[PDB]
Amino acid sequence: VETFAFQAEIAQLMSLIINTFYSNKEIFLRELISNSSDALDKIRYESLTDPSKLDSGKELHINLIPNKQDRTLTIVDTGIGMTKADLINNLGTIAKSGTKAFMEALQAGADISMIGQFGVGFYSAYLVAEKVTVITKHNDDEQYAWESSAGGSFTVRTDTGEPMGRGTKVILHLKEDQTEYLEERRIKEIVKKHSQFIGYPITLFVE
Numbered sequence: 001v002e003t004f005a006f007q008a009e010i011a012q013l014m015s016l017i018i019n020t021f022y023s024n025k026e027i028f029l030r031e032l033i034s035n036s037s038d039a040l041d042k043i044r045y046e047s048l049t050d051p052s053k054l055d056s057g058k059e060l061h062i063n064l065i066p067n068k069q070d071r072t073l074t075i076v077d078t079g080i081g082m083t084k085a086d087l088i089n090n091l092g093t094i095a096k097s098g099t100k101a102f103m104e105a106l107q108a109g110a111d112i113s114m115i116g117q118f119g120v121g122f123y124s125a126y127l128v129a130e131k132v133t134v135i136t137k138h139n140d141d142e143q144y145a146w147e148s149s150a151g152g153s154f155t156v157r158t159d160t161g162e163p164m165g166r167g168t169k170v171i172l173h174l175k176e177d178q179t180e181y182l183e184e185r186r187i188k189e190i191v192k193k194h195s196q197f198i199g200y201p202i203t204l205f206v207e
């Protein structure tokens with residue numbers, strides 16, 4: 001298990017997301033489903049010029065899995081997935097500018113629900129999760145497990161769990177007072193309200 005420090009700007013973004021009083025927390029689901037949709041769009045596009053990229057799975061969809069026992073809400077997709085480079089250096093590099101613009105916008109009248117227009121909606125996961133675990137698999141890399149409870153650092157490890165084929169699982173370890181996001185009625189409401197037009201099947205699991 002390797003431990004890394006988030007770049008200062010990202011750690012700052014996460015702290016703001018965690019400390020700012022902001023009641024409209026449900027927007028986290030929209031951001032994650034949107035990220036899944038972009039990832040699915042990408043593998044689909046790429047497969048048009050190279051069909052073999054779908055040998056790791058032809059089905060393009062999204063699953064929302066709540067589990068009260070583990071108090072987790074997992075967003076699963078069979079999208080493009082992320083490499084080790086994405087997880088450790090590239091995604092953070094890109095996120096640095098998005099964060100800067102977002103934090104300046106926030107000081108102008110913008111609010112946290114607009115975080116997605118700055119390309120860093122992933123971090124809105126910390127509005128409801130005390131810890132986020134990301135299991136991802138990209139076609140020409142191995143399956144990895146990224147993890148962070150914020151605090152300025154994250155870990156990355158080669159995942160020996162059950163193989164996924166290709167895609168990403170964002171496991172949200174929910175805060176004690178945010179278990180409403182494990183309720184079927186609540187999730188259905190949010191999906192219908194913010195992601196009703198996603199171009200991929202979204203299956204909400206029942207417990």
Ligand SMILES: CC(C)NCCCn1c(Sc2cc3c(cc2Br)OCO3)nc2c(N)ncnc21
Pocket residue numbers: 035036039077079080081082087091092094095119120122134146168
């Ligand atoms: C071009 C690239 C920057 N777009 C993808 C951003 C990374 N990403 C994201 S957003 C993201 C995810 C992270 C992350 C940072 C971001 Br930003 O570190 C922990 O895992 N969600 C994705 C997903 N479901 N599938 C594939 N890629 C995902």
